[PDB]
Design a protein around this ligand. Structure first.
Ligand SMILES: Nc1ncnc2c1ncn2[C@@H]1O[C@H](COP(=O)(O)OP(=O)(O)O)[C@@H](O)[C@H]1O
Ligand SMILES: Nc1ncnc2c1ncn2[C@@H]1O[C@H](COP(=O)(O)OP(=O)(O)O)[C@@H](O)[C@H]1O
Ligand SMILES: Nc1ncnc2c1ncn2[C@@H]1O[C@H](COP(=O)(O)OP(=O)(O)O)[C@@H](O)[C@H]1O
Ligand SMILES: [Mg+2]
Ligand SMILES: [Mg+2]
Ligand SMILES: [Mg+2]
Ligand SMILES: [Mg+2]
Lengths: 523, 308, 534, 46, 534
């Protein structure tokens, strides 16, 4: 056999490849098309680990499904991108990208070149950005009511919508506490310092955000207190045990007293560490590494409560919450490194497990959202929805501009692009106007998932958006009627919708540039 | 013939024949095989006529002696001063190869190299190990070059010192690292002070070494390759760089005689014998880049460029 | 060696020929050299079976039967060849045997030699068609030189010594040279008895070559008449009949029977008795008709039954039954009788005459044969071959076939060239001279043709133990010096090199056919430059 | 879910298909080229 | 047969056609990715790993090629990418077309040596003609020349329409990393611009960092993440609890020493860190690790420590900020110190959150200007293709700034060379003449491919181009027509020097030289022996 490329190297090319990519993308779109809006339905995904994921989140769904077509791979990747960047719009992006590729299929069948289509798409994207920024409105982020409405307009499309007020307040409190500035750098890190702990049982209405943190831990010794009302807290990265040296420290004994002297020396070392700790007069000591029983003895003699092996992330949150500074050498321990600011340390039994609360903090720059509910799956969905809520709150606090929902923004932008296209005289006017009408898919899908007549409602809406001050008009995903968003209250973050449009248009551009698939070749 | 894994015994013998021709002359390895094959193909019909292989062999020996006589009579003497004759011989040898459009470039180089590595008045042969060939991808065959100095593929260890003018070069067959006896050696610590003392005395040992190196005027340092011991510790590299000395380690124990023959260096195996008379003076030592296709260390110019 | 090796400049399947991956192909000079290698192998196999001192080959068939022979055509027919050029060489030998009946080994050796010389010419770069054309030129020169140096022999029935010498030359190389002159004499007498001198035709169907294990090779003889592998129908009939008046019949001595579908209906005791009497009277009438014609012997082709057999015995009419059509025809031709299809048509003029009809035994065997001989002017004849084993009997049969074919070729054209390689040496000399006078590039091809013609004398010398080159050069030099194209190889070491004196004689048509066939097949082989096969 | 044609349908389309047709024709020609003319040769097929 | 090699053997036109077929396969893979209208390819690595690309070198690296004559062209694309950074597709296409036409000549029985001589002559004269007639000085053209060269390189990439902005970024970056060294020659060391990828915001949102961008983060969450008057310490050693080396053992025989020895194991590193921090270092980058014990010292000092930084990133930050990478805190006095002169400086060092990750930005370094680029797209596929395209653009701008000559694009150079060489072939021999004509004709595969990809009438367009260039070469008053090439958005020739379609001369020159070398190497093959593996 005289081949040039290895067998298993299969090469497709041309309009078959183009149509295949577009069909794979629009299939990814049809998978989650119904998961958009307030009247969506849940999907039960089965993990390879025997798990279950009951969700409405586009990125959760697409991340749990597996594909082999590279266009579908790219669509799943852009859903991941939207989730990582803004944490919302994970299904709006998929649907818009699918519709853009769908409308590009026309021009590709009609002998237009993909580069022409792409240049038109990029023109349209810039003009979309312009139109969104013109129709956006500002926000007074000090207005907790405005912020709660922003968060409700984002979680109404999720399961927690029944506990909307609770979840909104939880997310707002968590983000406002995680807001932190040091050396002129503002930081809302709701991934390291807003923690969600799901404890099955109880009821969701008792879920709360703590003014402090919570870990699943107990005292090292039951003689230690489990309730302290003004704890001075010390955090350590070092083991309070006697460990070996880094070198070959081998000893050689010939005298009798030397063995006992060595063991007593170990004990004295632990005593000296514990005294270096006691000198700061703490109430609680929390370690990422072990704590020997002799160290426990000395701390208890000092009336200190110890928690043995905490995670680095939990320790960092305890630091931010109680105002402490993690240390690694109790000899280097300072009052500035001691943690004052926690208002109560409690260690209580939730079910048959012991949980440590460091709550009642003042100015805690970290938090723990304690979720309670029927099951790990329900609580996983509540946690994902709360991630959405907190990420939306964060996007707003960073860029306080808002845009109207219910497809109002899509219709306003489509109208503006159609109006700008009348000055266009080249051949790109057609793909340009096509992406403009391809933005209409969001209200179309909303109407479909509400169960109303897309033709009639979308026609009335496209007509409403030809009037002057009607860029706020959209549709209810709950009744199937056109309303003013100024009256309904569904306002999305400009950052979210910008990222959505950009990701959609660029995904379309990528899949349009793609041709001539090749496969088989092994790295 | 060596690359096609011939299996018949006679064909193997022809392979060995071509190798022997490559040894004795290095040119004619195809003509010799063709001549052998043809003589045997004629022996075929001779055998058929009914002549004995011994008679064929003796008559072939006769024809060989007469043919050597004939070729010598045809021949004309040559003076090694006849550079045009040498150029024409080289061009003829190259006409058969893919590099024949480049003969105008590679024949004068093939004549210069040999005329640079032999005493033309006394030489009766040539050792082509005096001619080093360095294959580097990139460029074209029109970029082949004849370097009178030294070329190395080993990389320079210093950052910032790539070029050296008026270069004094030293070969180091000893290791610039913490002392290590050839016997089992340990350093037993029993007090905390001995630890600080150990680190400090190691620093001082290395610094004394690099200072004895600097004191000679050496600015280029070729370190032999050393398994069983670190030939160039990071401390030594730090000190050499601070002292502005280019360092090329991992030199191979087979390139040593070549490097010495080239740049007049003398290999030093004990720091006590590392002096100025054991160095080599080169007008330049540079790490040259080849259009992003790699790097080469070129030691060009030499006060003792010895037949290499 | 592959039909198609691309699979496409775009990665898509390239299927042009069916099973192209399992198929092979050889093109060009390598195909030519493969052909030459195969032909040289065949020719070097055959050259040791050439001449008086040539040795035989022992062929074993699919079912394990053994055949010892020196005949090149029989060897190459029994040979299980797979190579197509070797198949062409088998066809070449078969063609020489068909046209001539001798030379079947010379043709193969000569063709192999021509291809072996073409090998060097192709190495020097000559076009194979130019080689073939030079071979045609040299072959024409050699054929005319044979016509030039040929001699003529008398093909009369008075002095048969030249024909006996020709047949002895033919049989010198065969195992039957122990009875050299006896075999030659009987081949000559056979063809001259059965040969149309005016027509110049010899029908070999009139020569029955029969072999029977037993006896000695010296017992082989020519019967001027017929021999049959049958006996008299009744064991009490006499085993000898002298001055036999023979009735040859193709009617079974049985009650008549229509060929058409017939049903004879018996409807009464009178009908049954009439049928009975009809059968009786039919048998009696058959025997009475044969007797009234005057015959002393009957020979039927279709066997008969108990009543007819006993009536023949009672009426003193020895009879043979179940005689085959061909031997019935030969018996008619030999005895001068006419074949009769029914008894009513039998007359004293349609009878044949044989002065002796005898049943012959073969020792402790139970096998009997019938000899019919002493006819007046038998235009048919039989060669009865005896010997100690079926292998030497079959070899004797084919050797005598060679001798008969040679006498046939003399009757067709009496011109004779002298053998022992002398004709080949003379033709090589003539071709060399004309190549010297030829100024075109075919000079080389003609020199090659001469060097190939010189392979037959070399092969004879080698098989005779002489040094090929030495012997051939001395006899060539003698031929050019003293003009005598009858100077050749003393294979039998009679001292003289003169083949005209040793009476080593070939047929001019034989040598000419050798040269022509070898050249034509070498041409068709050099014209091939591409082989395809699964 | 359901394919238009029967599984195993091989469709070659476009400029590559045309160039491949031309190349196959070149092969067929090569198979007979050397038989042309007074200096032409014969082919042996089995 | 006769040759007993244990392998397959191709010989003659068979292997020549095979070599050309392989080269054609490789070129047909990439032809569709040539020019502003070329399109990208997916490549799946047998596991679902996806790669989008238009870069021919990338494509041929990712492919698994089996034929050696095709491996040659893959290596050709790799070599073009190493020595130039652009032209990796054009060089392969041209090499394959030269191979095609040269094999056509060899089929017509022009000797391959003659084809090779003619190709070498045509390559030399094409290089000379370019250097003499088709170059424009970037000094005569200004900075818009660099912008146009970058935009020309970016056409055919996924940063095409955004070229208006990406070209500004590339030019600013290359001018930022411009540095002059000893010999006073200006050097533009690309690969010192850092390129980071972060899916997220649109392409237009990609950032040019005046300074440096590090794919690293601080070592401890208690450390600050912004520092303004950054004093930077670049260390090539690890900051960990000190362990005695291999040839040093602690053997205690007095228990009273164990405590002090164990404490020294940490106090050594503590002392080194205190020495570093005493000079004012608030930012400490390390190629090695930093134990938690040490990170706590940095935290308490209010410093920013970074561990496991890459050696090349550290070298660049040091060169850019004015720092000295230290492998050890050791001076020529046998002590351990850290001088404030070994520090570097920067107007800011921050940990910035890009998408869902974080990196470090070192902004406004003194003692040199540096440049980093954070590419922002929709997913990793886009980001990788943008990285490759940006590397191409950076290499192109580097070549334009090093050699101040550019040539027009759109097949202008190839059309001019086709005309000039088909006129020049008339002077050199008769068969080398045909070889030079075929070289000229081969050069036209570039505008042909551009038009084919643009879906335009390649025949008409290239004929118009050649007509323009012939008018330019025969009428001295219209020499400005040299600058005419294809406008692939309209299917009409155009003055590409005024349109801004520029290529560095080195691109075309090296393309021609390398393609010629590859064609000669492949054409020199007349046999192939493929040994059966063991
Ligand atoms: N009450 C509502 N009526 C109509 N549309 C709504 C309502 N609430 C949200 N939407 C719209 O639904 C979309 C969000 O749906 P969702 O399922 O959260 O998808 P994603 O967040 O992945 O885009 C936005 O267009 C938003 O404006
Ligand atoms: N007595 C003889 N002396 C010399 N040569 C002979 C003699 N008998 C036969 N030959 C030669 O041997 C050759 C081969 O003859 P033979 O083997 O009988 O049949 P074929 O010609 O088929 O091989 C003839 O060319 C003839 O010249
Ligand atoms: N704007 C343009 N108009 C016409 N031709 C162009 C333009 N930009 C680039 N080209 C041509 O595209 C060809 C190849 O470009 P590309 O495939 O991107 O890079 P390369 O082939 O050099 O790897 C070059 O011949 C170039 O002249
Ligand atoms: Mg949402
Ligand atoms: Mg030679
Ligand atoms: Mg005979
Ligand atoms: Mg390019």
């Amino acid at each position: 056999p005289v081949l040039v490329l290895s067998q298993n190297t299969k090469r497709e090319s041309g309009r078959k490849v183009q149509s295949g990519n577009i069909n794979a993308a629009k299939t990814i779109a049809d998978i989650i098309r119904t998961c958009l809006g307030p009247k969506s339905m849940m999907k039960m995904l089965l993990d390879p680990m025997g798990g279950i994921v009951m969700t409405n989140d586009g990125n959760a769904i697409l991340r749990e499904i597996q594909v082999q077509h590279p266009a579908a791979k790219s669509m799943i990747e852009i859903s991941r991108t939207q989730d990582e960047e803004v944490g919302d719009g994970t299904t709006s992006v998929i649907i818009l990208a699918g519709e853009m590729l769908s409308v590009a299929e026309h021009f590709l069948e009609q002998q237009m070149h993909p580069t022409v289509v792409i240049s038109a798409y990029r023109k349209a994207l810039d003009d979309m950005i312009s139109t969104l920024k013109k129709i956006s409105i500002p926000v007074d982020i000090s207005d907790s009511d405005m912020m709660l409405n922003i968060i409700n307009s984002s979680i109404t499309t999720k399961a927690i919508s029944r506990w909307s007020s609770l979840a909104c307040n939880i997310a707002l409190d968590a983000v406002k506490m995680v807001q932190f500035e040091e050396n002129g750098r503002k930081e809302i890190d709701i991934k390291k310092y807003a923690r969600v702990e799901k404890i099955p049982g109880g009821i969701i209405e008792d879920s709360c955000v703590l003014r402090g943190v919570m870990i699943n831990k107990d005292v090292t010794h039951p003689r230690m207190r489990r309730y302290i009302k003004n704890p001075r807290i010390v955090l350590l990265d070092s083991s309070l045990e006697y460990k070996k040296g880094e070198s070959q420290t081998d000893i050689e004994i010939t005298r009798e007293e030397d063995f006992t002297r060595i063991l007593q020396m170990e004990e004295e070392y632990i005593q000296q560490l514990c005294e270096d700790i006691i000198q700061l007069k703490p109430d609680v000591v929390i370690t990422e590494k072990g704590i020997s029983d002799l160290a426990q003895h000395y701390l208890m003699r000092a009336n200190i409560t110890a928690i043995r092996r905490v995670r680095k992330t939990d320790n960092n949150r305890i630091a931010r919450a109680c105002g402490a500074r993690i240390v690694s050498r109790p000899e280097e321990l300072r009052e500035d490194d001691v943690g004052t600011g926690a208002g109560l340390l409690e260690i209580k039994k939730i079910g048959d497990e012991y949980f440590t609360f460091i709550t009642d903090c003042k100015d805690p720059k970290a938090c723990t959202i304690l979720l309670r509910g029927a099951s790990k799956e329900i609580l996983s969905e509540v946690e994902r929805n709360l991630q959405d809520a907190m990420q939306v709150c964060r996007n707003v606090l960073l860029d306080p501009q808002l845009v109207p929902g219910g497809g109002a923004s899509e219709m306003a932008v489509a109208h503006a692009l159609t109006e700008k296209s009348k000055a266009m005289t080249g051949v790109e006017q057609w793909p340009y106007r096509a992406v403009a009408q391809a933005l209409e898919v969001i209200p179309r899908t909303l109407i479909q998932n509400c169960g109303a007549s897309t033709i009639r409602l979308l026609t009335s809406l496209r007509a409403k958006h030809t009037q002057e001050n009607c860029e706020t008009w959209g549709v209810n995903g709950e009744t199937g009627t056109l309303v003013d968003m100024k009256e309904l209250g569904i306002w999305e973050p400009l950052a979210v919708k910008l990222q959505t449009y950009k990701t959609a248009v660029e995904t379309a551009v990528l899949l349009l540039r793609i041709d001539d698939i090749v496969s088989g070749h092994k790295k | 013939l060596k690359q096609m894994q011939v299996l018949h015994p006679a064909a193997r013998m022809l392979v060995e024949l071509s190798k022997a021709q490559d040894i004795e002359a290095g040119d004619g390895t195809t003509s010799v095989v063709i001549i052998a094959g043809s003589l045997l193909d004629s022996c075929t019909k001779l055998l058929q006529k009914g002549i004995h292989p011994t008679i064929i062999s003796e008559s072939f020996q006769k024809a060989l002696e007469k043919g050597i006589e004939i070729l010598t009579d045809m021949s004309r003497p040559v003076e090694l001063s006849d550079r045009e004759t040498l150029l024409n011989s080289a061009t003829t040898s190259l006409n058969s190869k893919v590099v024949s459009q480049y003969s105008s470039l590679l024949s004068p180089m093939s004549v210069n190299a040999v005329m640079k590595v032999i005493d033309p008045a006394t030489a009766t042969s040539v050792d082509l190990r005096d001619i080093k060939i360095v294959k580097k991808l990139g460029g074209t065959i029109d970029d082949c070059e004849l370097v009178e100095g030294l070329v190395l593929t080993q990389k320079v260890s210093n950052s910032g010192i790539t070029r050296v003018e008026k270069a004094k070069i030293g070969l180091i067959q000893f290791c610039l690292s913490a002392p290590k006896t050839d016997m089992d050696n340990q350093i037993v610590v029993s007090d905390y002070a001995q630890m600080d003392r150990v680190l400090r005395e190691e620093r001082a040992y290395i610094l004394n070494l690099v200072k004895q190196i600097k004191k000679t005027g050496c600015n280029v340092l070729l370190i032999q390759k050393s398994i069983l011991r670190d030939a160039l510790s990071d401390l030594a590299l730090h000190f050499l760089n601070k002292m502005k000395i280019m360092v090329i380690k991992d030199i191979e124990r087979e390139d040593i005689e070549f490097i010495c023959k080239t740049i007049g260096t003398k290999p030093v195996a004990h720091i006590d014998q590392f002096t100025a008379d054991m160095l080599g003076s080169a007008e330049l030592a540079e790490e040259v880049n080849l259009n992003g296709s790699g790097k080469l260390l070129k030691i060009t110019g030499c006060a003792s460029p010895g037949k290499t | 060696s592959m039909g198609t090796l691309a699979f496409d400049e775009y990665g898509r399947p390239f299927l042009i020929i069916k099973d192209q991956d399992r198929k092979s192909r050889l093109m060009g000079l390598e195909a030519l050299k493969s052909h030459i290698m195969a032909a040289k192998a065949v020719a070097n196999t055959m050259r040791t079976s050439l001449g008086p001192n040539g040795l035989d080959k022992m062929m074993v068939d699919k079912d394990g039967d053994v055949t010892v022979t020196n005949d090149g055509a029989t060897i190459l027919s029994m040979m299980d060849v797979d190579h197509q050029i070797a198949k062409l060489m088998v066809e070449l030998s078969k063609s020489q045997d068909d046209e001539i009946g001798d030379g079947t080994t010379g043709v193969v050796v000569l063709a192999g030699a021509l291809l072996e010389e073409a090998e060097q010419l192709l190495d020097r770069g000559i076009h194979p068609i130019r080689i073939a054309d030079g071979y045609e030129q040299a072959a024409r020169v050699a054929i005319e030189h044979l016509d030039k140096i040929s001699d003529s022999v008398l093909v009369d029935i008075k002095d048969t010594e030249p024909l006996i010498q020709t047949a002895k030359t033919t049989l010198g190389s065969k195992v039957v040279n122990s009875c050299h002159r006896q075999m030659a004499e009987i081949a000559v007498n056979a063809v001259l008895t059965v040969a149309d001198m005016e027509r110049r035709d010899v029908d070999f169907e009139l020569i029955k070559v029969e072999g029977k294990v037993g006896g000695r090779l010296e017992d082989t003889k020519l019967i001027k008449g017929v021999i049959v592998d049958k006996d008299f129908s009744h064991p009490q009939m006499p085993k000898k009949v002298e001055d036999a008046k023979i009735a040859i019949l193709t009617c079974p001595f049985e009650p008549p029977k229509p060929k058409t579908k017939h049903k004879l209906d018996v409807t009464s005791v009178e009908d049954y008795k009439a049928l009975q009497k009809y059968e009786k009277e039919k048998f009696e009438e058959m025997i009475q008709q044969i007797k009234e014609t005057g015959a002393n012997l009957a020979i039927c082709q279709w066997g008969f039954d108990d009543e007819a057999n006993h009536l023949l015995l009672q009426n003193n009419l020895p009879a043979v039954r179940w005689v085959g059509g061909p031997e019935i025809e030969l018996i008619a031709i030999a005895t001068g009788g006419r074949i009769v299809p029914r008894f009513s048509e039998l007359t004293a003029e349609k009878l044949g005459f044989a002065g002796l009809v005898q049943e012959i035994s073969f020792g402790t065997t139970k096998d009997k044969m019938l000899v019919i001989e002493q006819c007046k002017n038998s235009r048919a004849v039989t060669i009865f071959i005896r010997g100690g084993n079926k292998m030497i009997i079959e070899e004797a049969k084919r050797s005598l076939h060679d001798a008969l074919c040679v006498i046939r070729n003399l009757i067709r054209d009496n011109r004779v060239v002298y053998g022992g390689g002398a004709a080949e040496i003379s033709c090589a000399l003539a071709v060399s001279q004309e190549a010297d006078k030829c100024p075109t590039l075919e000079q080389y091809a003609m020199r090659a043709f001469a060097d190939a013609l010189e392979v037959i004398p070399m092969a004879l010398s080698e098989n005779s133990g002489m040094n090929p080159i030495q012997t051939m050069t001395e006899v060539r030099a003698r031929q050019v010096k003293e003009m005598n194209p009858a100077l050749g190889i003393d294979c039998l070491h009679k001292g003289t090199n003169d083949m005209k004196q040793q009476h080593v004689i070939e047929t001019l048509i034989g040598k000419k056919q050798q040269i022509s066939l070898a050249t034509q097949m070498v041409r068709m082989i050099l014209k091939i430059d591409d082989i395809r096969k699964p | 879910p359901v394919i238009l044609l029967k599984e195993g349908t091989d469709s070659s389309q476009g400029i590559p298909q045309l160039v491949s047709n031309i190349s196959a024709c070149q092969v067929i020609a090569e198979a007979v080229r050397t038989t042309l003319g007074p200096r032409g040769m014969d082919k042996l097929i089995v | 047969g006769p040759l007993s090699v244990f392998g397959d053997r191709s010989t003659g036109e068979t292997i020549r056609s095979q070599n050309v077929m392989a080269a054609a396969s490789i070129a047909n893979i990439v032809k569709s990715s040539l020019g502003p209208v070329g399109l990208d390819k997916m490549l799946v690595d047998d596991i679902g790993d996806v790669t989008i690309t238009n870069d021919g070198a990338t494509i041929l690296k990712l492919l698994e090629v089996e034929h050696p004559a095709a491996k040659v062209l893959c290596e050709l694309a790799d070599l073009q990418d190493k020595e130039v950074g652009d032209g990796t597709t054009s060089v392969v296409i041209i090499a394959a077309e030269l191979l095609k036409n040269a094999d056509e000549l060899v089929k017509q029985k022009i000797h391959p040596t003659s084809v090779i001589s003619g190709y070498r002559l045509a390559c030399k004269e094409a290089v000379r003609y370019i250097n003499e007639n088709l170059i424009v000085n970037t000094d005569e053209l200004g900075r818009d020349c660099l912008i146009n060269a970058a935009k020309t390189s970016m056409s055919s990439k996924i940063i095409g329409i955004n070229g208006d902005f990406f070209a500004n970024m590339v030019v600013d970056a290359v001018l930022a990393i411009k540095y002059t060294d000893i010999r006073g020659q200006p050097r533009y060391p690309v690969n010192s611009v850092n390129i980071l990828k972060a899916h997220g915001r649109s392409q237009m949102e990609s950032m040019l960092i005046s300074g440096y961008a590090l794919n690293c983060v601080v070592g401890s969450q208690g450390m600050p993440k912004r520092i303004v008057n950054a004093k930077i310490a670049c260390l090539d050693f690890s900051l960990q609890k000190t362990k005695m080396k291999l040839g040093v053992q602690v053997v205690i025989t007095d228990p009273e020493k164990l405590d002090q020895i164990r404490q020294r194991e940490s106090d050594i590193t503590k002392e080194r860190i205190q020495k570093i921090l005493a000079t004012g270092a608030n930012v400490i980058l390390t190629t090695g690790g930093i134990d938690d014990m040490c990170l706590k010292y940095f935290v308490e000092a209010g410093a920013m420590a970074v561990r496991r930084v890459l050696k090349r990133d550290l070298k660049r930050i040091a060169k850019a900020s004015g720092a000295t990478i230290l492998s050890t805190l050791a001076n020529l006095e046998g002590e351990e110190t850290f001088e404030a002169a070994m520090l570097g400086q920067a107007e800011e060092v921050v940990q910035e959150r890009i998408c869902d990750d974080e990196l470090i930005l070192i902004k406004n370094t003194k003692a040199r200007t540096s440049a980093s680029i954070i590419l922002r797209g929709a997913n990793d596929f886009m980001c990788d293709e943008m990285e490759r395209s940006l590397h191409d653009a950076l290499c192109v701008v580097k070549r334009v700034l090093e050699s101040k000559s550019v040539v027009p694009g759109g097949g202008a150079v190839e059309a001019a060379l086709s005309i000039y060489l088909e006129n020049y072939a008339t002077s050199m021999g008769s068969r080398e003449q045909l070889a030079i004509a075929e070289f000229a004709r081969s050069l036209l595969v570039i505008p042909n491919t551009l038009a084919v990809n643009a879906a335009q009438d390649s025949t008409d367009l290239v004929a118009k181009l050649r007509a323009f260039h012939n008018e330019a070469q025969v009428n001295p008053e219209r020499k400005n027509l040299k600058w005419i090439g294809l406008d692939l958005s309209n299917g009409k020739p155009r003055d590409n020097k005024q349109a801004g379609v520029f290529e560095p001369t080195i691109v075309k020159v090296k393309s021609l030289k390398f393609a010629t070398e590859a064609a000669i190497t492949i054409l020199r093959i007349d046999d192939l022996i493929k040994l059966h593996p063991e």
